[model samples]
Every structure is written in structure tokens, then in C-alpha cells.
Target: AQYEDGKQYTTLEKPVAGAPQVLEFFSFFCPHCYQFEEVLHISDNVKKKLPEGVKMTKYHVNFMGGDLGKDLTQAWAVAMALGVEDKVTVPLFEGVQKTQTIRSASDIRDVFINAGIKGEEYDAAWNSFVVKSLVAQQEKAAADVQLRGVPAMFVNGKYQLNPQGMDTSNMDVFVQQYADTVKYLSEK
Candidate 1:
């Protein structure tokens, strides 16, 4: 609910925990992101070995959606409603992966509903201060942080790590080694 220097934040200016913040910047509509998702299912397992004071987060990066940031705005709102986000994050991923129906704010609302957050709860959260704030943060991050692409991760706000960084072209291997690298950095 708050952005702290040492707390994991999903942002472009800085993502990840700051003693060592790890951030994943992604747009739900990116095809490369979809390919990355198809491979990065090992995070839960890798988190088991992560050290203290280091955390991972995603910024829900968006540059498209017809008018700059629509996809991300709705995504942030949905994530806000789910609180921990992990609650509905998987379902969201599934929604994007399995169905090609989500492409706009209205579509995203459907995804939220399909994910089990219903009625006024969904509407209120989507329009809540929390979601708006998150969207502003992302917009600010994009401008000041000099972000270049979606589906990218910045480690400790200093290193740009990706599947290419691990020296592997396979998305799955890249993601696995990427997690391993995070665990290694967090512990160091």
C-alpha cells in the first residue's frame, strides 16, 4: 500500500526491494510478455530460497492500449482489489493466456469478474483511490525512469536483467536462471 525504499515496489523508476529491489516491468498485452509468462512459472518455488530484505515486484508496464495506459490502469486496479495480488494474479495470467477476449478496460473488467472479484466490490476497487494512485505512479515512472520496453526487469535499480542476460534464448531457461540470480543477489 506504500512505497518504501526497502520495500518491494512494482515501478519503472525502481522495482524490487532496495537493499536490493527486483522489478519486473510488463504489459499484459505484450506478446513477448506472454512468451515470458509461458516460461516463468518457477517463481513460487524460487521464492522459497530468497533471502531477507530483498523482494520482487511487477510494474504492470503499459505503453499501448490504444491511448498510452489503459491496460495498465485497469490492471493496477484489479491488483489493488486482490490486495496481495497473488490471489488473483494467476487467474489473470490464465485469463490472458487462455482467452483472447481481454483487450480493453471493459474487457479487463470482465477478467476481474471472471477471476472472482464481483459486483460493487470490483467496480469500487477499479475506481478507488488506490488504483488511480498506482496508475499515476506508473505514469511517472515511465517518464522519469526512462523505461524502454515491456517484459523487462531491473535489479536493484542498476542492472537490466532479462532472458538475454542469462545468455540463453529459451524463455523458460531464462526465467529460471533469472530467479536463481535474484536469490543469489538477495542473499549477497
Candidate 2:
């Protein structure tokens, strides 16, 4: 796929050093993100189509959940540290956006517990230095990109996808084109 500079993607002013990488900025509190995951399935579809060695990192944004934003970010970080992001992502999204039951850190912990994660393991990861560092990186990365919204994807840490430029009329075509664009940007 041939992507236009200002249309399909916009180059970053200060690019980070991670080629073949798709850094996804999202939030559990975002209804659009919930749809992106559950309805559009962009993340899963794109992952399946990405080129070999391409890495996709999900960075939970801390600017959406108000006072609970940072806590939610921490919760995501904890899930990542425990290697249970797959188990928690949908449930977390459902809790935050669907059922609207997740409002505090304790509620977030409950989701993990329900996912079969022990409370002690959850607490350890939640309070671990690695998870804390990951959360800090998420905050810094969002600020670095001047992120204004959720479900934004940056390829190679420099090329950010411009959704307005893509054809969103068809989900299959959108996902295919998105994957192709990420692949194209990764090589540049």
C-alpha cells in the first residue's frame, strides 16, 4: 500500500528508536477503543497481518479516566507485567466502557482476580518497579507524541496513522490497508 505523508500518516517531529514497531495509544475508558477492540477488531486483525518481527505495543493512556486514569494505566501495566494482557484487555474494557463498573484501582484488581489472577500476584505486579516503570513510559510516550485521542497507532515510532485518511467504510479493507501501511512505514 502506498500511503501519503499527510493523509495516511504523519511523521513525528521527535521520533523514538524503534523500527518495525507499532505503538498503540489507547484507554479502557474510551468507548471508541472498546469498539476498536470488540467491534472492529483492528488490533487483532492488524497483529495477524503485520510483517515478521514487527512489534505492537499497547500503551494505556492516562488522560481519559479522570482521577482513575493513572490508576487504569497502572492496571494495564500490571497486566502486561503478568503476561495476562490478553485475558484482561477485553474484561477491562467491558468493565470500564460497557458495564461501567471499574472506577477505582480496587475494581481493576477485581477484574484481574476474576481472570484467575491471584490477589497477591496482582498486588506484586501492581507494585513492582517494572510495572511502575512501564506506566511511567506510557505517560511520557503519550506526552511525547502530543497524543490527543485514544486508539492511535504509530508505526516505527515515527509514522502515526491518520484514520481520517483511511477508508473506514469496510472493516476488512480498513484492517488490510492499516496492516499494509504499518508494514510500509516500518521499512521506511
Candidate 3:
């Protein structure tokens, strides 16, 4: 099956407000998520064509829900808080999915450290009250969107772009259609 430009998404019955937003719900431990890393880094490519005011956000989920998941969730929130996503995200996913070396907070912290993240900055964000709240909020946001699996994309919090499945949409094309869907919804 091939992905159709305008037919591959479903607009949620009760659209979640916050227009022109592209959000992803994913887990650090998921293999599929590792594949999405390339797409994540190409946001600049997507943004070039997306309508102005559209923003991108990535939310980490804890479906595995144990020490590993909990720790990485905290690491993710901390990285976001520290504004080290470009530094930590790729390595974090690679550490878990490829190296299979990230097992705890210390291990996750090390990935950030190797990514050139400053020790003081990592410590402050990792232990901050704000990071804890953001992690909790991320968990809740996953549930709010009824997230069922990794690599799921929600546009405008209402439209869900079809991830790779029966129909295969390349990253660039998918990003364009995703923006198109958001544009469509914004006009409604």
C-alpha cells in the first residue's frame, strides 16, 4: 500500500486544542523509536515548508514502566529542561537501542555527559522540581492522547499521521503531509 497525501490521517472526534502543533509520543526503549531519530533531526527541513506558527514537540512515554523506563523518562525531561535535546536525544536512543548500555540514571547521565552536556547543567536539570513535573506531565500527555505504541505522531493534537505500516510514507513526504494536515485543521 502507498500513503495517500490527503487520506492517511484521522481527525480526532474531540480535537485536542493547541493548533498547529506536531507532537510525537514515543518510548526510549522502543526499536521503532530508534528509527524515528532521523526524522526527529530533520525538523529544520520540515519547518522550512510547514506553515508558520507550527511547532514541534516530542514527549517521552513509559510503557515499559520500570527502573530503566523511569530513569530514561527523567533523563528525557531533564534534557528538555536543560535544552540539550540536540545533544542528548540521538545518543540516548542509540545508547538504549543500539549499544544496549543505558540501564539506569547513571548510564543515561553518562550519555548526556558524552554528548558534551555540562555536568553542572545536567545535575541541576536532572534533580530539579521542574523536571519531575515535566516528566509527570509527559506521562499524562501520553495517556491523554491514548497512545498505544511508539513512533505515533499527533498533529494539532487532533490529527494522527499514519506511521509506517501497510502504507509507507517517506520521512520528507510524511512531514509535508503532516504539515498539510495541520494547515487543513487550522483553517477549520
Candidate 4:
């Protein structure tokens, strides 16, 4: 997707309906993703400094436990459908990152419940058709994106993977580069 950008800089596409497409992928149990969270936040804050059309966001990667991480992702899908993702996303991220306890359905449900979702609403949304559709969509996007790990990001539809370069392990550099990367891309 970024080969063109690598060769020559260009504006790829305009914002759809006045807002540019912004995307990120992450998982709760992923230590790297957790570490990358601050960088991601910095990247977002940087984007917010851009014009209104350049809005950005991160999609919590739903690896409930492993092997596709289906269940909790499904639970996450419910939040996505409910349009209440923002309220719960960061808190859930903090819970998992801080306590390292978001490893099962009950744990995830408890987290959601504590995040202000009513019990009945949570159950119904979890089982609703909307969440089911969202789960399929999230899985399809992940597979099609061909990402091998969490903490991946896209800015204005361009890949921002490991912004310090593809092989660097210094996370702070990666984070700073990500901020710089977002700033650079927002200008295009």
C-alpha cells in the first residue's frame, strides 16, 4: 500500500465524507501493543493537532486469548456495534496492561461491566446480530491487512508499521518515530 509513498510522495486520497480514514490494530494481552499504547496515544494527539478532516483512531485487536482470539474480540465487537467503544477502550487497555488479567471471557465481561455497560445491555449486545457482523468484519480486515502483530497503525490509509524502521527494537524510538510519522503523513 505504501510502495508509492516510498518511491514518491503524493496525496493518496481525500477524506471520505470530510474525514480521512485512520486506523490502528491492537490486542489486550500483547505486551508489545501495551508498550506501544503510549506511542499510539502520542500519534493520536499529534493527529488531533492536524486539521479536522484528519481524524484518527485505533481498533482494539480482539485476541481474546489466542488462536484468532475470537471470544473477547466478539465481546469487543459488541462495544463497536454499540458505538460505545471509546468509553471502554482505554479503560480496558489499562486494566489488561496494568493487571495482566484480561485473559478470559469472564474477565473481559467483568471489565466491560465495570466500564458502565449495564448487564442486560452487555448480554444482548454480545449476542446481537450487529456484533456478529462486526466480528466477521474485524476478522476479515485483520486477515486482509496481512499484519503479523499488534501495535500496527495506518495513517490516512498508509502503513505506519514500526516507524523507526522495520527492524528496530528500541520502543521509545519507534514511538517517537510514530509521532513524527503521523505528522509527516498528515501533511500529505
- Best by lDDT, which number? 2
By lDDT rank, best first, the candidates go 2, 3, 4, 1
Clashing pairs in 2: none
Q: What CA RMSD would you report for each candidate? A: 7.1, 1.7, 3.5, 5.2
lDDT (10s digit) by residue, model 4, range 1-188: 54345422333243223223556677766777656654445545556555667656555555545643666578778778777776776666766778667666777788778878888998899889888887776676665555566766655554444443432576555455556556666666
lDDT of each: 0.59, 0.84, 0.71, 0.63
Taking all chains together, each candidate's TM-score versus the true structure is: 0.72, 0.92, 0.81, 0.71
Give one digit per residue, the lDDT tens place, for model 2 in 40-107: 88888778867787767888997786878889899988988889989999999988878889878899
Lowest-scoring 10 consecutive residues by lDDT in candidate 2? 13-22
- Which candidate, 2 or 3, has the higher lDDT? 2
Model 1: per-residue lDDT, tens digit, 3-105? 2223332323543333226666666666676666555554454465567666766666667555425665566655754674666555555566567565556
Which parts of model 1 are misplaced by more than 4 Å? 1-20, 42-46, 87-98, 167-173
Question: Cα miss at 79, model 1 (Å)?
Answer: 1.4
The list of candidate 4 runs beyond 4 A from truth reads: 1-20, 38-40, 62-64, 166-177
Residue pairs that clash (backbone atoms under 3 angstroms), model 3: none
Candidate that beats the other on lDDT, 1 or 4, i.e. the better one: 4
